Structures are given as structure tokens and as C-alpha cells.
């Protein structure tokens, strides 16, 4: 019903007077496979608790993507914090040609065919945020034909 994916689990440290307090940050994407995708960061003292927090945050921070039969509507960029993501639609047999932390986002979002490329920093949190930024930057032909008062055929004709 709602596909969930754990991209990364990190061990962070706090350094208190006694010593180091090691914590775990998760990072997950959830998505219905049909253009709804969200990500949750989540963090806790233990890894399964961090993962549960991340999943519960992703379930409620989901956005809508207008995608065209399992691929993008047009080439799109998605910058976030030094991470620059470039995604681009592909024919219906290409598969998800995307790096780490883009692959999971697109797979749970339902983009089956995409030619993506990550530039700059490939830090997974920012890459996920950048992928989602690009996916919501994407416009559908009906959205464009609504913005410019015009028929969908008059636009894509």
C-alpha cells in the first residue's frame, strides 16, 4: 500500500562531560508508488527507534508529484544545500538510472524510468531533499495549460 525505504542510518555523537553519547539518525522515504512521496529523518538512542521515528515522520510529510506514466514530465533540477540533482524522463524500459538516495526516492515515488544525476554534495539527507524539490518543481502539461490560459493541445501541439 505504502512502500517504505531506509536510505541511510548514521551514528552521531554528542560529547558530554562523561564522554560521548552516541545516537542514531535514520533517513527514510515513504511513497504510494503513484506520485506521493515523503521523507522522514528521525533519530533516537537506538537504530530501530530512529527508523520508526523516521517512518512516522515520512508518512506525514508526503508531497504530490504529477508524473507521466512512471516517468517525469520534463527535465528538472532540484538544488538543496550544495546538492544539485538533475532528473530527466526516459523511455519505458530504461529503469531508474539514479545514484544513491535518489534511487530510493524515485522508486517509492513511482518514477520507474528516469535519467538522474547528482551534482555537488551527495550527502543523502540533502540529496533526498533536492530530489523531492525537483519532483515538486516538475510541472504537468495540464498545470502549464492552466497557468497560461490555453488548451493542453495548444500547449503541447
Amino acid at each position: 500500500e505504502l512502500q517504505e525505504k531506509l536510505i541511510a542510518v548514521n551514528r552521531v555523537s554528542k560529547t558530554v562531560k562523561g564522554g560521548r553519547i552516541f545516537s542514531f539518525t535514520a533517513l527514510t522515504v515513504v511513497g504510494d508508488g503513484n506520485g506521493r512521496v515523503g521523507f522522514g529523518y528521525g533519530k533516537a538512542r537506538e537504530v530501530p527507534a530512529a527508523i520508526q521515528k523516521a517512518m512516522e515522520k515520512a508518512r506525514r510529510n508526503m508531497i504530490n508529484v504529477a508524473l507521466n506514466n512512471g516517468t517525469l514530465q520534463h527535465p528538472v533540477k532540484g538544488v538543496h544545500t550544495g546538492s544539485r540533482v538533475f532528473m530527466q524522463p526516459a523511455s519505458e524500459g530504461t529503469g531508474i538510472i539514479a545514484g544513491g538516495a535518489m534511487r530510493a526516492v524515485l522508486e517509492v515515488a513511482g518514477v520507474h524510468n528516469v535519467l538522474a544525476k547528482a551534482y555537488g554534495s551527495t550527502n543523502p539527507i540533502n540529496v533526498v531533499r533536492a530530489t523531492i524539490d525537483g519532483l515538486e518543481n516538475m510541472n504537468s502539461p495540464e498545470m502549464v495549460a492552466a497557468k497560461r490560459g490555453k488548451s493542453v493541445e495548444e500547449i503541447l501541439g
Partner: protein
């Protein structure tokens, strides 16, 4: 082959020649004390091992937190 002519007196010159001979033989036959090679101090060896073990623990904590308990 020594030539001693510092003095107007042959006896002074003869003793000066013998003195030069003795001084030269001494300086040429005195043996340089041998230099035995030294090792790193065991304190430094333990320092090396301790730094290695500390970085070992830090690298074990760093990086990949895979298994995921999931």
C-alpha cells in the same frame, strides 16, 4: 717523513721532530669509539600502539552503521 726546522738549534729541532712523530702516531692510531645503534624507546612504541588503538576505536564508530536491526 718529517722536517723539523723551527729552531736555530739542531737538538731543539730533533726533539721537535720526535714530538711531531709521537703526536701524529697518537692522532692516527687513536680509535674512534664505536657507535652502537639506538632503538625507539618502548614508551614511544606504546605511544604508537595506543594512538593506533584509539584511531581504531574511532574508525570502528565511524562510517557505516549497517545491519540496521530492521
Amino acid at each position: 717523513v718529517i722536517k723539523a726546522q723551527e729552531y736555530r738549534s739542531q737538538e731543539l729541532n730533533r726533539e721537535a721532530a720526535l714530538a711531531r712523530l709521537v703526536a701524529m702516531i697518537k692522532e692516527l692510531t687513536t680509535e674512534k669509539k664505536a657507535r652502537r645503534p639506538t632503538r625507539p624507546t618502548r614508551a614511544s612504541k606504546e605511544r604508537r600502539l595506543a594512538s593506533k588503538a584509539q584511531k581504531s576505536s574511532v574508525k570502528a564508530m565511524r562510517g557505516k552503521v549497517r545491519s540496521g536491526r530492521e
